[PDB]
Amino acid sequence: RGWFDVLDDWLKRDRFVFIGWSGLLLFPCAFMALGGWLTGTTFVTSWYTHGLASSYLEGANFLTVAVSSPADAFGHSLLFLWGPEAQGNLTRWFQIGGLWPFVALHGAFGLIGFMLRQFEISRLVGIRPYNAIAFSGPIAVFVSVFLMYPLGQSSWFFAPSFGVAGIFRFILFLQGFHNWTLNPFHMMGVAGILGGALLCAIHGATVENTLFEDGEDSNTFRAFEPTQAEETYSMVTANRFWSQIFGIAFSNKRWLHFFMLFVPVTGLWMSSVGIVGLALNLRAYDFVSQELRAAEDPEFETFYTKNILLNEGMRAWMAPQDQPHENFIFPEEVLPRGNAL
Amino acid sequence: VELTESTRTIPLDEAGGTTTLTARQFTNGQKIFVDTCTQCHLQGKTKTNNNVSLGLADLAGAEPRRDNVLALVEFLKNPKSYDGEDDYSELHPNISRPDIYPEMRNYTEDDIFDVAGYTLIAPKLDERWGGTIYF
Amino acid sequence: GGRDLPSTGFAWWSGNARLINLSGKLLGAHVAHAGLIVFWAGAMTLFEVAHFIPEKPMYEQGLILLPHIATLGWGVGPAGEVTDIFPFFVVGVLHLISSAVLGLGGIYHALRGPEVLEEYSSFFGYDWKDKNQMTNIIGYHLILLGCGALLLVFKAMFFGGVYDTWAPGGGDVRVITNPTLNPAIIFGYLLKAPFGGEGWIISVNNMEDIIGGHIWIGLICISGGIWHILTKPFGWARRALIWSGEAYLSYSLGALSLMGFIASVFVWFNNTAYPSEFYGPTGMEASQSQAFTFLVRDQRLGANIASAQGPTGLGKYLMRSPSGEIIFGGETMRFWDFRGPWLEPLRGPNGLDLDKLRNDIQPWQVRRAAEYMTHAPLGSLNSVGGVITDVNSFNYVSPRAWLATSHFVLGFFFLVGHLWHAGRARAAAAGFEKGIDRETEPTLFMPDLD
Amino acid sequence: GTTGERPFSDIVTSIRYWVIHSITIPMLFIAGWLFVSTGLAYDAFGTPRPDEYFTQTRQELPILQERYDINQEIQEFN
Amino acid sequence: ASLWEQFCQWVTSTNNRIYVGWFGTLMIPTLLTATTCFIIAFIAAPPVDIDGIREPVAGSLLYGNNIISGAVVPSSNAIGLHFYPIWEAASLDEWLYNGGPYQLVVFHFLIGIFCYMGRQWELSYRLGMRPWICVAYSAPVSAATAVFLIYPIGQGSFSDGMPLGISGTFNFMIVFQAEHNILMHPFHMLGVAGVFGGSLFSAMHGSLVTSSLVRETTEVESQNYGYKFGQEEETYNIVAAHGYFGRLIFQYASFNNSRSLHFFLGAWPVIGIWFTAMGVSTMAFNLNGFNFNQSILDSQGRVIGTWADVLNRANIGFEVMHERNAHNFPLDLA
Amino acid sequence: DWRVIVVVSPLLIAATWAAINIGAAAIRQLQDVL
Amino acid sequence: VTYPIFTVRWLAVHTLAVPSVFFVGAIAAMQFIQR
Numbered sequence A: 001r002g003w004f005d006v007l008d009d010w011l012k013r014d015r016f017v018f019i020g021w022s023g024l025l026l027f028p029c030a031f032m033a034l035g036g037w038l039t040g041t042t043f044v045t046s047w048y049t050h051g052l053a054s055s056y057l058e059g060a061n062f063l064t065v066a067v068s069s070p071a072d073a074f075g076h077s078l079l080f081l082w083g084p085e086a087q088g089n090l091t092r093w094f095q096i097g098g099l100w101p102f103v104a105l106h107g108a109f110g111l112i113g114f115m116l117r118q119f120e121i122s123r124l125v126g127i128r129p130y131n132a133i134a135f136s137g138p139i140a141v142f143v144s145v146f147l148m149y150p151l152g153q154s155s156w157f158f159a160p161s162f163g164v165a166g167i168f169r170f171i172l173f174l175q176g177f178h179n180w181t182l183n184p185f186h187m188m189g190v191a192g193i194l195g196g197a198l199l200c201a202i203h204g205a206t207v208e209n210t211l212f213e214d215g216e217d218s219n220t221f222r223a224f225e226p227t228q229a230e231e232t233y234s235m236v237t238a239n240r241f242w243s244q245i246f247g248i249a250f251s252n253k254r255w256l257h258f259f260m261l262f263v264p265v266t267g268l269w270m271s272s273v274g275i276v277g278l279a280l281n282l283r284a285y286d287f288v289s290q291e292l293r294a295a296e297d298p299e300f301e302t303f304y305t306k307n308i309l310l311n312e313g314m315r316a317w318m319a320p321q322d323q324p325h326e327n328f329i330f331p332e333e334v335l336p337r338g339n340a341l
Numbered sequence B: 001v002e003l004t005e006s007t008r009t010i011p012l013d014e015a016g017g018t019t020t021l022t023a024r025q026f027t028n029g030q031k032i033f034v035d036t037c038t039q040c041h042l043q044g045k046t047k048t049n050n051n052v053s054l055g056l057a058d059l060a061g062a063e064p065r066r067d068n069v070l071a072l073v074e075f076l077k078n079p080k081s082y083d084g085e086d087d088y089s090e091l092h093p094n095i096s097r098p099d100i101y102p103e104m105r106n107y108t109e110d111d112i113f114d115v116a117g118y119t120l121i122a123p124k125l126d127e128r129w130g131g132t133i134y135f
Numbered sequence C: 001g002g003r004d005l006p007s008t009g010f011a012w013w014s015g016n017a018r019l020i021n022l023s024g025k026l027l028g029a030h031v032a033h034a035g036l037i038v039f040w041a042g043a044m045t046l047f048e049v050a051h052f053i054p055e056k057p058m059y060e061q062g063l064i065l066l067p068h069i070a071t072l073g074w075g076v077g078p079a080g081e082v083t084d085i086f087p088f089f090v091v092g093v094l095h096l097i098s099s100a101v102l103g104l105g106g107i108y109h110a111l112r113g114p115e116v117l118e119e120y121s122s123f124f125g126y127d128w129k130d131k132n133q134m135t136n137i138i139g140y141h142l143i144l145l146g147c148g149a150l151l152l153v154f155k156a157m158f159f160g161g162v163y164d165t166w167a168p169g170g171g172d173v174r175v176i177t178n179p180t181l182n183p184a185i186i187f188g189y190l191l192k193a194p195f196g197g198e199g200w201i202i203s204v205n206n207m208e209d210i211i212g213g214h215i216w217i218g219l220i221c222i223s224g225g226i227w228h229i230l231t232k233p234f235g236w237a238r239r240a241l242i243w244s245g246e247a248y249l250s251y252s253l254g255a256l257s258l259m260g261f262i263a264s265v266f267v268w269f270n271n272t273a274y275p276s277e278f279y280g281p282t283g284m285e286a287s288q289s290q291a292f293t294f295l296v297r298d299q300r301l302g303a304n305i306a307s308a309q310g311p312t313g314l315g316k317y318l319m320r321s322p323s324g325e326i327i328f329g330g331e332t333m334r335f336w337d338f339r340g341p342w343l344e345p346l347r348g349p350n351g352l353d354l355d356k357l358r359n360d361i362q363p364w365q366v367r368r369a370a371e372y373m374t375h376a377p378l379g380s381l382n383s384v385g386g387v388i389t390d391v392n393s394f395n396y397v398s399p400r401a402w403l404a405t406s407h408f409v410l411g412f413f414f415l416v417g418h419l420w421h422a423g424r425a426r427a428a429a430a431g432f433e434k435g436i437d438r439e440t441e442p443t444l445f446m447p448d449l450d
Numbered sequence D: 001g002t003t004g005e006r007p008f009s010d011i012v013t014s015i016r017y018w019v020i021h022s023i024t025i026p027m028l029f030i031a032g033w034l035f036v037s038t039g040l041a042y043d044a045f046g047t048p049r050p051d052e053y054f055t056q057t058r059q060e061l062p063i064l065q066e067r068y069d070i071n072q073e074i075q076e077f078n
Numbered sequence E: 001a002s003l004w005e006q007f008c009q010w011v012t013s014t015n016n017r018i019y020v021g022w023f024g025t026l027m028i029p030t031l032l033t034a035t036t037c038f039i040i041a042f043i044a045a046p047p048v049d050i051d052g053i054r055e056p057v058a059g060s061l062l063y064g065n066n067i068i069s070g071a072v073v074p075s076s077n078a079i080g081l082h083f084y085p086i087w088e089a090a091s092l093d094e095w096l097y098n099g100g101p102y103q104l105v106v107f108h109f110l111i112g113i114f115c116y117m118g119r120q121w122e123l124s125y126r127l128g129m130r131p132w133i134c135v136a137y138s139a140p141v142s143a144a145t146a147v148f149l150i151y152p153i154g155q156g157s158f159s160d161g162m163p164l165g166i167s168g169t170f171n172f173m174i175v176f177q178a179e180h181n182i183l184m185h186p187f188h189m190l191g192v193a194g195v196f197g198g199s200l201f202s203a204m205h206g207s208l209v210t211s212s213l214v215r216e217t218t219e220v221e222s223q224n225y226g227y228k229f230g231q232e233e234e235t236y237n238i239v240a241a242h243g244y245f246g247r248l249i250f251q252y253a254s255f256n257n258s259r260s261l262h263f264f265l266g267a268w269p270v271i272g273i274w275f276t277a278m279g280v281s282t283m284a285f286n287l288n289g290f291n292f293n294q295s296i297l298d299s300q301g302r303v304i305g306t307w308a309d310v311l312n313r314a315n316i317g318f319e320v321m322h323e324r325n326a327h328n329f330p331l332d333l334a
Numbered sequence F: 001d002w003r004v005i006v007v008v009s010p011l012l013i014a015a016t017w018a019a020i021n022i023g024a025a026a027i028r029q030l031q032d033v034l
Numbered sequence G: 001v002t003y004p005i006f007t008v009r010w011l012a013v014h015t016l017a018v019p020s021v022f023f024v025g026a027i028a029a030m031q032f033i034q035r
């Protein structure tokens, strides 16, 4: 028994927390990402990068803490602790936003490790690896939003900050500057996510309301046995119900569950494609035909042109505070605004 | 920095007088402002007439100047129009009319002095003080 | 009755379902819960009294029970100023003490009293299928509810009256001497469109109508009580309805959902049964007040508010409603159905009257409009008042907002509960609430759809 | 179905676990407390105290602009 | 026997290709009415003066909209909450100009969806099913009612109902955020958890079932042909899926009871959507999301910003531009 | 820094408590696994 | 019976719980900071 196989045995033991070879990458990297985020949201400020308090130590709450993105002056520097910026000074590394790349990079490798874990466990137990394939969706989202978008932009500063209100800021920023709602790829993402939720709800309810009478209790949960060979609910009755209610119904269980995988995953992937576009400011910002007609015809108004106006207002009012490194100075009189407001 | 003595030092009267609020005076003034003046003067604005705000420029532009503590206390006893021509004691909360302004009948002279001092100290802590309603 | 899953068929998280056929235990649960209700009433009243600054308006202090007591005419006088704080304290105390008694009785019945009541007394014993006994209990309770309605009537007539925000000379506690028994008005309220300008029963705008409708409600409820004591359900009702404990629960849940929706709307729109003196302005009131405040200010500045056109070409201060009435301009055009005691002295037959606007506006009306505009029912969840983009220094959320939001949420979840229990009651009566029987799966005997 | 380790309910219902932990858990709680309450957290992470966001000479946001010399920049911000 | 009994037997028949039912006798007419009007209006309706300031907004394709920008525009702010049926307009042109189509479509649609939920119950009863699919359906219905009925009621105008269009939906959302800070409202946070988690659990459940499919096909044909409609045998190995998942996270976090698993799949998104519907319905009464603007002050008393202040800046920017000609007075109360 | 000493001392107290209450059995287990 | 005391599970438990409790103590202390 060579040392490699002895290690393989130890790593793949049946214990409370399976480790596996993938655990070597997953657990330290996941721990770094999670502990870095908790440490930043508890203790670390964004005063020097954003001019914002972003930790419990400064009086922020769960909704307003964040591991904020680094200062825009660093471009896409990876901001290693030992790098030319912090130069091994941990306190400075915290103050310049080193925690953001720390968390982002360890999270990316922890995500890799987790998908490798999915593969490893699927191989060990003897099933098909469709869980890893499904997890590719969240991976695409994380790569596109947290890595690809800022890499296309001027710096990590424009990456989403790891915090609740930081994420909301990123969301509103994308609306105002990129008109992300108008983007057909975001639209397909929305459809995928809403359809996934719909499928989850409808499938759970359908199963729960076509159950077979397999027990005597009003509590129907105890009339199932994991080793039972037969279906626990009536696919035939479910199909008839949905055919008569909605017009169509699933008749193939395998297709149903594959569809439940396919919908949200496809949605995540399409929205990731859209975010890649936004990284290069390749927006679906405008419909030129309506823009031209409005520029010539002062009576032409659509909801599209109204949304354009909202975006203009948001940009002008938010940019000075959202981009403090720019030293934007917008005198009050240049701010766009409607009457009386 | 701290809420230092210089920061709490404000014009007392028009002849160059000067008074420093204590930290307790400032805290009571802020408390009173939030309880009774924040409904119409959030952030130094005047919701019902923002031509007359609590900003430093507006306060000093009144007749007479209200950018000092005694003039503020006088206004809060006997409110007048901005040019000091009409009597607003039926239209503005004041301690002189507890019959129509009951939210004010429990305030002392110390309380009014504190709130006037807070009104003078707040603008220099907040560049938004006394601006546009949406600002 | 069993107290676990094997002997009841219900899990712990559905454990109260175990009480469906234990009439004594169920009575104990109901009485103890009634104690909880009365306890909250008393404790919340005492809390609000303790946290009450009697010269600061009620709506500025997060009070929802004290306004109910004030509207009933206790402890308040003209303009709603709090005269005596002791009646609020007494209401709270009485509820707290009776809550103690109710809790003791509920505990007795739930824990030691007889498990079922049917073999102890025919009067209190009941069976859900006993249509006569179920209607008897409906009848007893209908008589009680009619008594409660007449209690309101008696308070308004002979026991000091109620707070009338529409009182001439100023809103005040007044004795209602001429309630409208005229059935045309009372029951035409129920026929009014539930839409803008009609406001089905939300639009009741005078204490005479409220008291007269309550006299009618008392009579209807008492007569229905006697009707249900002395009769059994007819054939049509027997054939249309499900006759079971869960079915009756579902019916009551539907009723409660309807009532919760209605109360949320009532508190949002009505300023008669919910005087703005105690509950603050309605949203409509606050919008109208802002328009009025700036009309008055710009008029004092010299603006000819009759002829001033705004940027769009509609009048800045005044305009016409789609039916021609003279109304405040701006977005508050949507709120032109608003009526409030501070605004009606300026309304003529055609709507707002230029002559009154130019020479009838009183300082108290100006003060009231300013107050109502600055207490618009807008606020954050953490109780920061004003529009959401304002800063943290104004700690206010309208009681109307609290009441309307809470009652809309409760109404919806009780509609959900009604759906749950109605569906379950039907399925249990037909015997498939536990799943499809494999032998007799109905779909298997059904022809294919295509 | 047990992978070998002692069940949690067993451990956390044992006397010895509680003799150990009624000490260890409060000790960590108060160590974190003291970490904050002694001011150590401010110095360890460089987080400003409420009086050090602005100084008597820097009234504006201390936004970093320098690409490599941030130690000097931070020290000049104070 | 009688003509009425025969009609009853027909309406409640489980042999109809589409179940009708008593709820269907209301659903079908109202839904067809809403659909016909919606199609006609989306294609060809003239512009609607939504804000009541004689500034009509073009919603239909024939007036220059594409599919993304087109909409059935909410009725005029001048109408407010008034009932505006066709017969209350002096002319069809007047009815169209004031946004009557929106009211017609919305009222019929809402009646129809409530009847759809009743019809779901009815058919489950006729088929001897358990009755609670309609309860799951009450979540989307609640959300739709919030955005088309409850919010306009609280705000006092159908002009403030969600427009029936894509860009109109986005406009609704942006203004809603500007006025209520829905992102900082916990009920919307719960709705987001509902939909993100529902999609997560959909992906997880679908992937675990697909992973544990029993071999019944060859590598050439679709594995979907391994399942035959109406078999009792289970088409996948739930014990293998549990083995995998309990090793992915840990044993006791994995369902091994399919019934509890499917109850959880039903309950999670449904509860999340109920909560977000209630969030919209209560912001209808202007009980808004959290406001932490200027919550953090330094020792002197100067405000230290947080991400909440940046969000508020964005909200103000949206607010000052929205309905740019509609406001005459400094506070957006109505 | 004395602050470091006072922040670390509770951790050491917890560690030594756990050691003195678990060490016999822990050493037993260490020896058994060699 | 007679299970091992220290395990990979013990380490996974503590790796999380121990810093969690320390952080909670820190945040508790934060609750009483005055400006």
Ligand code: CLA
Pocket: C040, C047, C048, C051, C061, C062, C063, C064, C381, C383, C399, C402, C403, C406, C407, C409, C413, E271
């Ligand atoms: C109709 C019910 C109702 C309404 C309208 C109010 C309204 C109010 N209360 Mg009050 N209260 C209530 C019930 C109610 N309360 C009950 C039952 C209790 C006993 C616990 C209290 C005890 C209480 C105290 C001690 C205080 C108040 C206070 C207040 C005021 C401040 C509100 C606030 O900020 O809370 C904050 C809002 C929240 C905490 C959000 C609550 C959200 C809940 C959890 C919603 C639940 C959702 C849903 C139903 C879940 C079930 C569905 C399921 C199917 C999933 C306000 C006017 C304060 C006050 O100002 O006193 C003068 C105050 O100090 N209340």
Ligand code: CLA
Pocket: C027, C031, C101, C102, C104, C105, C106, C108, C113, C114, C117, C120, C121, C124, C125
């Ligand atoms: C709706 C509430 C309710 C109902 C239906 C019952 C029903 C019953 N109780 Mg119970 N009980 C209750 C509440 C209730 N109780 C409360 C709140 C308490 C705490 C004081 C008790 C404490 C209690 C005890 C200790 C006992 C019962 C017993 C009984 C059973 C015999 C009744 C009897 O013949 O005595 C005779 C009935 C009367 C003499 C009529 C008196 C009516 C009341 C007391 C006077 C006030 C009437 C009032 C004006 C009406 C409206 C009430 C008002 C608050 C609105 C019976 C099934 C007995 C039992 O179980 O026997 C085996 C018994 O031992 N109860």
Ligand code: CLA
Pocket: C138, C142, C190, C191, C220, C221, C222, C223, C224, C225, C227, C228, C231, C232, C233, C234, C237
């Ligand atoms: C909470 C109090 C209460 C409760 C639970 C009941 C319950 C009942 N009553 Mg009733 N009743 C009451 C109070 C009450 N009553 C009062 C106070 C009176 C005096 C007026 C009556 C007089 C009365 C009579 C004369 C009869 C009943 C009957 C019945 C039974 C069947 C009726 C039915 O199907 O309901 C539902 C109603 C229908 C199915 C008919 C349709 C009604 C319309 C179409 C519904 C539309 C409402 C609309 C959508 C809501 C808008 C509000 C408004 C604008 C109308 C039932 C057990 C019947 C019975 O069995 O006799 C013993 C009967 O004939 N009651």
Ligand code: CLA
Pocket: A218, C012, C013, C014, C015, C016, C017, C249, C253, C413, C414, C415, C416, C417, C418, C420, C424
């Ligand atoms: C008067 C109203 C009423 C009554 C008497 C009942 C009675 C009953 N219900 Mg029911 N239900 C109701 C309203 C009511 N319900 C409403 C409004 C809904 C919609 C949500 C439901 C939905 C419902 C379901 C899905 C079920 C029942 C069931 C039952 C039976 C057993 C339930 C049990 O043991 O509770 C046990 C209590 C709990 C498990 C605690 C629940 C805690 C809730 C979810 C959260 C509380 C939130 C609240 C606002 C406080 C916030 C706390 C905050 C401070 C954090 C029982 C006969 C069961 C049944 O069908 O039996 C045959 C069952 O499965 N009900």
Ligand SMILES: CC1=C(/C=C/C(C)=C/C=C/C(C)=C/C=C/C=C(C)/C=C/C=C(C)/C=C/C2=C(C)CCCC2(C)C)C(C)(C)CCC1
Pocket: A031, A032, A034, A035, A036, A038, A039, A040, G015, G016, G019, G020, G021, G023, G024
């Ligand atoms: C940074 C860094 C690092 C790392 C670190 C770490 C890794 C750590 C950590 C950490 C951690 C790891 C921490 C923690 C924590 C925690 C917390 C803070 C918690 C909490 C909580 C809570 C609050 C909860 C609550 C609740 C709820 C809400 C539900 C129910 C009930 C309860 C109570 C449960 C190092 C040194 C390497 C290097 C440098 C950098």
Ligand SMILES: CC1=C(/C=C/C(C)=C/C=C/C(C)=C/C=C/C=C(C)/C=C/C=C(C)/C=C/C2=C(C)CCCC2(C)C)C(C)(C)CCC1
Pocket: C032, C033, C035, C036, C039, C046, C093, C096, C097, C099, C100, C102, C103, C104, C106, C107, C110
């Ligand atoms: C059965 C059951 C249950 C329930 C229970 C209940 C529901 C209850 C209740 C109860 C109640 C409901 C109670 C009560 C009470 C009360 C009391 C005990 C009182 C009193 C008194 C006093 C002492 C007062 C005093 C005072 C005065 C006189 C005035 C001033 C102020 C004061 C406060 C000082 C449960 C769920 C648990 C479960 C199991 C079963």
Ligand SMILES: CC1=C(/C=C/C(C)=C/C=C/C(C)=C/C=C/C=C(C)/C=C/C=C(C)/C=C/C2=C(C)CCCC2(C)C)C(C)(C)CCC1
Pocket: C185, C186, C187, C189, C190, C201, C204, C209, C210, C211, C212, C213, C214, C216, C217, C240, C241
């Ligand atoms: C006091 C007052 C008043 C009065 C009121 C009144 C006079 C009332 C009433 C009322 C009434 C007198 C009512 C009612 C109701 C009814 C209901 C709510 C119903 C229903 C229904 C149902 C639920 C049915 C169902 C069904 C069908 C549909 C068929 C089949 C069978 C069944 C059963 C399922 C006024 C406004 C002047 C003023 C304010 C205060």
Ligand SMILES: [Ca+2]
Pocket: B035, B036, B039, B103, C060
């Ligand atoms: Ca006030």
Ligand SMILES: [Cl-]
Pocket: A306, A307, A310, E171, E175, E321, E322, E323, E324
């Ligand atoms: Cl807009």
Ligand SMILES: [Cl-]
Pocket: C329, C330, C331, C332, E326, E327, E328, E329
């Ligand atoms: Cl306006």
Ligand SMILES: [Fe+2]
Pocket: A203, A207, A257, E205, E209, E262
């Ligand atoms: Fe499934």
